Write an enzyme that holds these catalytic residues in place. Structure first.
Site, PDB file in Angstrom:
ATOM      1  N   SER A 180       0.836  -1.326   0.039  1.00  0.00           N
ATOM      2  CA  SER A 180      -0.085   0.034  -0.039  1.00  0.00           C
ATOM      3  C   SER A 180       0.953   1.075  -0.166  1.00  0.00           C
ATOM      4  CB  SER A 180      -0.983   0.023   1.329  1.00  0.00           C
ATOM      5  OG  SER A 180      -1.977   1.081   1.064  1.00  0.00           O
ATOM      6  N   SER A 203       4.807  -1.343 -13.867  1.00  0.00           N
ATOM      7  CA  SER A 203       5.179  -2.314 -14.629  1.00  0.00           C
ATOM      8  C   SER A 203       5.552  -1.599 -15.971  1.00  0.00           C
ATOM      9  CB  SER A 203       4.387  -3.423 -14.881  1.00  0.00           C
ATOM     10  OG  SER A 203       3.357  -3.285 -15.743  1.00  0.00           O
TER      11      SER A 203
END
Length: 333
Positions: free
Chosen positions: A154, A260
């Site tokens: 988180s 990513s």
């Protein structure tokens, strides 16, 4: 590069009053067990609501200290907002940031308003404290300078993203689990949660700028291995208003995708995209199997290793992973 500030003497366990940029910080060290010589390092970070003690010792929070029994020297920083108490959970931590910061648990992203401009090209006091912290612990314990890894869940995942982006010549890699990217327009203009979410959905394979890192994102970063983890359809977060009502303020599908895309595009970065179905919390299925596999995977790519010689091994049941950007989060055009 092993040095301590002002003659600080590190010890096993809780370290307090560590001086850094005018602040007094704390962190907990669990020295690696059954290791001869330089040990790889794991710097786990909690999120907005779980305490550093929870992140280190509670099974559902990851019990990250157990990795010291796996041969890693674990060095866990306490959030500035916790005032050096490793047991503070969400108290005075789980809420909006100040002084130009977006979220209060960690100095992990510039705010959406003008007060955040200052952080477009300044890593912030947490990113620099972690480097100083590891450099100091290394004067007491023998650490492997090619295997310094950090990660978290988180807000701790967001902090991992920021640290990797600003300190890619220090860390060997990281494990950003359900961290934010705070996607912005290409010119750096902050976007609302809805607009940022739509921006990635509209261009899922492109590199997106974000408030989590420098603006603009660095053209090149140092050698790393980054394992981004998405928790599936339930990997979302509902903020809490002062009156107690809840509302959606973060969706980690776009942020893990964006992260990513950026790391996969870098030539000296091996990016591993991992998906699970545990939602927005520390990986829940076969948790310790996952922690062992993830850290050993990171350690298999010491800093400066050739991305071409990297070989991914099968993760525990409950996880699907591959080298490259995420591919199963948005439909192909």
């Amino acid at each position: 590069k092993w040095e301590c500030p002002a003659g600080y003497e590190v010890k096993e366990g809780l370290n307090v009053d560590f001086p850094h940029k005018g602040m007094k910080r704390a962190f907990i060290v669990y020295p690696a067990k059954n290791v001869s010589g330089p040990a790889p390092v794991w710097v786990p970070m909690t999120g907005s609501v779980e305490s550093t003690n929870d992140n280190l010792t509670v099974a559902r929070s990851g019990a990250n200290s157990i990795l010291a029994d796996h041969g890693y020297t674990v060095i866990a920083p306490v959030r500035a907002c916790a005032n050096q108490d490793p047991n503070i959970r969400g108290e005075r931590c789980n809420g909006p940031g100040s002084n130009g910061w977006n979220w209060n648990p960690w100095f992990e992203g510039r705010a959406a308003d003008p007060s955040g401009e200052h952080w477009k090209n300044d890593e912030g006091p947490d990113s620099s404290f972690f480097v100083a912290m590891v450099q100091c612990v290394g004067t007491k314990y023998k650490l492997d300078a090619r295997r310094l890894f950090l990660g978290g869940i988180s807000s701790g995942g967001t902090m991992t993203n920021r640290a990797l982006l600003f300190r890619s010549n220090f860390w060997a890699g990281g494990l950003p689990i359900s961290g934010e990217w705070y996607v912005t327009s290409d010119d750096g203009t902050p976007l609302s949660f809805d607009d940022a979410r739509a921006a990635v959905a509209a261009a899922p394979t492109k590199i997106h700028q974000g408030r989590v890192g420098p603006y603009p994102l660095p053209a090149k970063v140092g050698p790393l291995i980054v394992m981004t983890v998405w928790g599936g359809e339930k990997d979302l977060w509902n903020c809490t208003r002062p009156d107690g009502s809840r509302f959606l303020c973060a969706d980690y599908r776009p942020s893990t995708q964006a992260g990513s895309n950026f790391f996969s595009a870098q030539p000296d970065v091996v990016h591993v995209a991992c998906s699970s179905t545990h939602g927005h919390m520390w990986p829940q299925l076969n948790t310790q199997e996952f922690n062992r596999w993830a850290l050993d995977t990171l350690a298999s790519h010491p800093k400066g290793s050739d991305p071409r010689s990297f070989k991914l091994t099968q993760p525990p049941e409950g996880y699907t992973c591959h080298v490259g950007p995420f591919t199963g989060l948005y439909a192909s055009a």
